[PDB]
From a paper:
Recently, [name] has emerged as an intriguing addition to the dynamin-like large GTPase superfamily, which has been widely implicated in mediating biological membrane remodeling events, including membrane tubulation, fission, and fusion. To obtain an architectural overview of [name], we carried out structural studies on modified [name] [name] constructs in different nucleotide-loading states. For these constructs (collectively denoted as RNF112T), the N-terminal RING domain, the predicted transmembrane helix, and the C-terminal amphipathic helix were removed. RNF112T is composed of a GTPase domain (GD) and a middle domain (MD) comprising a 3-helix bundle.
Nucleotide-free RNF112T contains several disordered regions in the nucleotide-binding site in the GD, involving all G1-G4 motifs, which take up as much as ~15% of the total GD in terms of the number of amino acid residues. Thus, the disordered G1 motif of [name] in the nucleotide-free state makes it unique in the dynamin superfamily, representing an extremely flexible catalytic center before binding nucleotides. However, nucleotide-free RNF112T and RNF112T-GDP form 2 adopt a unique conformation that has never been observed with ATLs. The MD of nucleotide-free RNF112T stays perpendicular to α8G and swings ~30° from the position of GDP•AlF4−-bound RNF112T MD when the GDs are superimposed. Compared to the GDP•AlF4−-bound form, the Hinge 2 loop in nucleotide-free RNF112T involutes toward the GD from the outstretching conformation, leading to an ~90° rotation around the long axis of the MD. Importantly, the GD also exhibited local conformational changes at the backside of the nucleotide-binding pocket, involving redirection of helix α4G and relocation of the loop between α7G and α8G, which creates a big groove to dock the MD. Accompanied by the wedging of the MD into this groove are extensive interdomain contacts. Met456, Met458, Phe459, and Ile462 from the MD; Phe452 and Pro455 from the Hinge 2 loop; and Ile280, Ala284, Tyr308, Met311, Met315, Phe441, Val444, and Leu445 from the GD form a massive intramolecular hydrophobic network. Therefore, the interdomain contacts are unique to nucleotide-free [name] and stabilize its specific conformation. Given the similarities with other dynamin superfamily members, a special structural feature of [name] is seen at its nucleotide-free state, which is characterized by a 30° rigid-body swing of the MD relative to the GD and a new intramolecular interface between the two domains.
Author numbering: 148 to 193, 198 to 219, 230 to 233, 240 to 335, 344 to 381, 397 to 544
Write the structure that this text describes.
């Protein structure tokens, strides 16, 4: 079939994330490039011009030519074939990803956050389209993305480009946003990113030729820096499309299992870490109970299990992340119900057996 965009992920009627497994398999586990170092360019927010220029520039570098089969929706879409760019004596497989979603509509916000989080999780580089100054919801997506690099290798940096489509000077723009963020005292990683030039801002004029040339200039700049921003995984191997297929499956499951309320991307991110912490506590309780002797005096056993139980609820509140207390309360209550099940099983076994 002629190469075309494929919808990788969408949301079903229940807000669950659904993955085209067979489709993603075909793209990512192709025996030609699946062990080539991979690069996932992702576009988010709100284009056809930008996307088509990126493909035209990529297809030129692929055929060893010089930079100077089109792109058409509420999901994650990918161009089903990668562009193989020369690097070392090998190749880099560039996949092109587009996150279609609302940014500010309050309907289906949890699902919008989930789709976007998934794209950001697997991206090597983010192109974020904004209209004028950065709004809070955009900045929160940006902070989530900045946090997704802190768990993907040691010297991993998260690269973000901001395409401001309707500002009215890119110097005054970035300086302005740095000032607003400095007073707000929130979004510390975006602030740091803006000050370290890891986040770049590009201002696009609205007339055709000035927009055309600015897009061309920007697209040339990001395809040229692709080969030097290869991500490495936790192990230290360069990211490959096989790895990306695995990450996509696993983080889709993590997102569908994040069953606690959240109103913002950072809250969804902290909810994911807090659920993990819950499981580290329950496992820690199970281990503690397994190491207790069957010879222990039943009274001394009851007190030790009770105090350990209490200490673990304290530990959940000490290491819980984020500031949504309503969510922490729901999770502690569920942790308490789970710990009491482990306790009831161990204790009821212990009393009747011994």
């Amino acid at each position: 079939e002629p190469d075309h965009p494929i919808q990788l992920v969408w949301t079903d009627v229940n807000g669950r994330l659904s993955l085209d497994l067979s489709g993603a398999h075909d793209c990512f586990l192709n025996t030609r490039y699946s062990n080539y170092p991979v690069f996932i360019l992702c576009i988010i927010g709100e284009k056809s011009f930008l996307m088509n220029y990126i493909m035209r520039a990529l297809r030129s570098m692929e055929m060893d030519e010089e930079i100077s089969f089109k792109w058409s929706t509420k999901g994650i879409w990918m161009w089903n074939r990668p562009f193989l760019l020369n690097h070392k004596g090998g190749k880099i497989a560039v996949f092109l990803l587009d996150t279609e979603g609302s940014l500010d509509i309050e309907s289906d916000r949890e699902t919008c956050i989930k789709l976007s989080a998934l794209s950001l999780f697997i991206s090597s580089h983010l192109i974020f389209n904004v209209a004028s100054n950065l709004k809070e919801t955009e900045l929160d997506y940006m902070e989530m993305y900045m946090n997704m690099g802190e768990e993907c290798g040691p010297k991993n940096l998260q690269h973000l480009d901001i395409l401001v489509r309707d500002w009215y000077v890119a110097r005054s723009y970035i300086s302005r946003e740095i000032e607003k963020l400095e007073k707000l005292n929130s979004y510390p990683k975006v602030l740091w990113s803006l000050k370290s030039n890891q986040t770049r801002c590009f201002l696009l004029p609205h007339m055709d030729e000035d927009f055309q040339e600015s897009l061309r200039s920007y697209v040339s700049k990001v395809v040229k820096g692709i080969c030097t921003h290869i991500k490495t995984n936790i192990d230290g191997e360069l990211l490959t499309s096989a790895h990306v297929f695995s990450m996509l499956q696993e983080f889709t499951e993590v997102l569908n299992l994040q069953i606690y309320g959240f109103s913002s991307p950072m809250e969804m991110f902290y909810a994911i870490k807090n659920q993990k912490l819950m499981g580290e506590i329950e496992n820690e309780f199970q281990d503690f109970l397994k190491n207790q002797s069957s010879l222990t005096l039943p009274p001394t056993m009851r007190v030790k299990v009770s105090q350990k139980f209490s200490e673990l609820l304290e530990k959940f509140m000490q290491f819980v992340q984020g500031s949504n207390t309503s969510s922490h309360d729901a999770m502690l209550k569920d942790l308490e119900v789970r710990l009491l099940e482990i306790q009831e099983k161990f204790c009821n076994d212990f009393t009747t057996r011994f």
